[PDB]
Symmetry: D2
Subunit: 213 residues, 4 copies
Amino acid sequence: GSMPTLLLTGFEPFHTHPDNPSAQAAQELHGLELPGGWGVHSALLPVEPHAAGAALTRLLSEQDPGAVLLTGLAAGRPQVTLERVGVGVMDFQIPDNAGQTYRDQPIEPDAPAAYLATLPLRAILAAWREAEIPGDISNSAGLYVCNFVLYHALHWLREHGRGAVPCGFLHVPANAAVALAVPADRPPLPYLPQSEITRAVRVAAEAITAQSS
Amino acid sequence: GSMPTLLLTGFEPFHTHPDNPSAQAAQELHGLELPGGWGVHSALLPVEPHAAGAALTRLLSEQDPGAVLLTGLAAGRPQVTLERVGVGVMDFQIPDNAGQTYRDQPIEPDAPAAYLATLPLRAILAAWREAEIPGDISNSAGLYVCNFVLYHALHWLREHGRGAVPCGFLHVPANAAVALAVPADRPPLPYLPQSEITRAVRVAAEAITAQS
Amino acid sequence: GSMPTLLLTGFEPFHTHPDNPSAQAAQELHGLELPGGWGVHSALLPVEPHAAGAALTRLLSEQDPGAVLLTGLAAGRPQVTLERVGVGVMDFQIPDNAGQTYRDQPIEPDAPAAYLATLPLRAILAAWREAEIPGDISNSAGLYVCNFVLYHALHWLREHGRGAVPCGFLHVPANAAVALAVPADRPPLPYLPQSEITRAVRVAAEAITAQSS
Amino acid sequence: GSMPTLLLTGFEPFHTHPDNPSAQAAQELHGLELPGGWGVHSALLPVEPHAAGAALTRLLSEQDPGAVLLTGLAAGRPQVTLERVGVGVMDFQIPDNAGQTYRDQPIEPDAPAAYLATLPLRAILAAWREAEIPGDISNSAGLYVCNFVLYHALHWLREHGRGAVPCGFLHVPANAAVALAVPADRPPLPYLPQSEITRAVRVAAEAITAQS
Ligand SMILES: O=C1CC[C@@H](C(=O)O)N1
Ligand SMILES: O=C1CC[C@@H](C(=O)O)N1
Ligand SMILES: O=C1CC[C@@H](C(=O)O)N1
Ligand SMILES: O=C1CC[C@@H](C(=O)O)N1
Ligand code: NA
Ligand code: NA
Ligand code: NA
Ligand code: NA
């Protein structure tokens, strides 16, 4: 679509969480103009793998993005993290938003066990540090719906001759709304104000598109 | 002075931390006018109990506060917390800023084993929640310098007939500067942006003076 | 009762836990003969403060022990711990076994805010280390029923002219039974086999009675 | 040899740890006779990927095992865990025993991003539970030397037409010796007595050969 597009996704609330900070960040950053003619196109995905995969395939096909930043909540993690690897297995510790679970389930017959993310991981960490944002690389995204869409996107891009499109996953901590809903019988969550989370996603987006030059 | 004063303290950096969010919050809020004629008076304490006690005694005497909010860093905690109890023992897991440690050391011979904080704990929790700030009561402040000054202030106030002056401790998480300095071989810290920490201290101060 | 008695207590199961390792250890060590003519007398307490206090008062009065070792479960702690202080407040994050809760409730009108434990803390830590048992001092026992009985016993002993009787609290990790019952949606617990927990309680008992000489 | 062999490996001490429970477990279980004519063959690998890979290749070739159980220390984890996946990257947060680190380094150019472990994971979990041993599957082995040898063995087996040989990784908690050496300024480690760790490794080995 003429100018380069960064596809930015977040997820809906799920489980006992009343809010999803990845949804809030995607909503706030939609349409952001970045240097070099780049623009952010945001979308929200459902927390259910069949529908999330179908929606993500449509976005990848219709938007033909120059880079892909998938985001989601990791309640309990203290700092933003970049996923190194998407694994081709579905194994759900809690049900998805259709009440569904999967046990040791391969995502795709006759496909790789995993895909490495193709984002410029160290450049993003450096941009975060320069912006005074603590963060790190994670080497497991879980085997729930965030991992599923990471594997799904990397596989689709490779199969469509677009393996050079940088693509990865950014997990964010709880925001205040998520932390406030935790029951009194449970341990408190690390959290970040939503404005810090959104800024972290923005800084990652800016670093990704700066590198594609 | 003639108007009611909330005494607000923070601590200097210590150990491997290059910044102390409690220092930053106290500095930002000094002079804040609160409803009912209350004003915040801030001070920065050293992380060493002899000098901290001497400085805090001078503040309690000279500033004559109507309420006392002592604050400090609790690196590793995810949310602001209010200390329920100050224990009369110094036992240091790391040295203080004079390089000193204490082992099982009573703070004052012949004094109580502990003092309960006299801040309106549930009112502060409720004010935090209304401001969308997660937080809770803590039942141990450690036995390092933050606990020391909590015990010291509660004891001084009671010994001077001022036990009715609400007094307590507010531990804050790491800010970004504290979290960014953690070595690569160590676990990452929960943290909050400084503006969130300062706002939590402000909301607590406002709840304390509203109750008084 | 002629020879010196160490009073050893544990607690019944509570909450979602099917077993209490402090009960198991107290049961196994009842009647143990220790050097110097000392013998262990064990009892189990209910997880409910009114009945636990009444039972503990009867034990302190009827057994007239030379030392008191109160034990209980701290599910989530990795290593045995010795409580430094019992605080005169009841504040329950979960109900007790009568379904009861207390909020910011003073244990006793016109009594101290707290009592320091009078066990030989460093001698116990050293005995544990010599026995290759990791452990440490804890500076909060919580404000649930274990803290309640620690405060209760120290207060009773002081009020009855028996403040010199060494008295304290030993919190133990989950055993295997406790860890196996954790739901799949919850984080795993640190645990120790029951034989390690019982041995830790035994080593503490031996150090306490050795010091009373 | 003529009878089926389960190859069991552990690692030497590394970093600040004076002992490695995986070494102790492998040493105790060497030669264990299991039902069906199976026997355990143990070996101790160095915590350095070049020498560990060379030693493991020699073991896979010379011992010709019917199953492979690689074990190692995961200091901080509370319960035994089975690794689901070995990732083709070396990225070291602490140096190895040669003082070396690797940053984002592919293990082998032109090889898969990962290999899934081929042990009967659910059967092992069920055997642990029947033996009253808490445990679970882990979805990251780290990117240090334990992950390296998991990837190395799965790749070697597949490249030699032996992908059907069940092969995986079992991380164990600290034992008492590891936990006792932690400095006073650091958080305490979950741990298990060595006899509990060794029993967990034994129960896993028995479940693996029962399935084969
Ligand atoms: O935001 C989300 C949606 C699913 C979940 C995950 O990490 O898989 N976090
Ligand atoms: O800010 C501070 C100074 C000392 C330390 C403590 O909690 O004791 N935190
Ligand atoms: O064993 C027990 C009974 C009550 C609980 C506690 O720590 O208070 N642990
Ligand atoms: O026992 C060991 C050797 C290396 C380390 C690891 O998990 O990679 N644990
Ligand atoms: Na005044
Ligand atoms: Na100590
Ligand atoms: Na053979
Ligand atoms: Na790294």
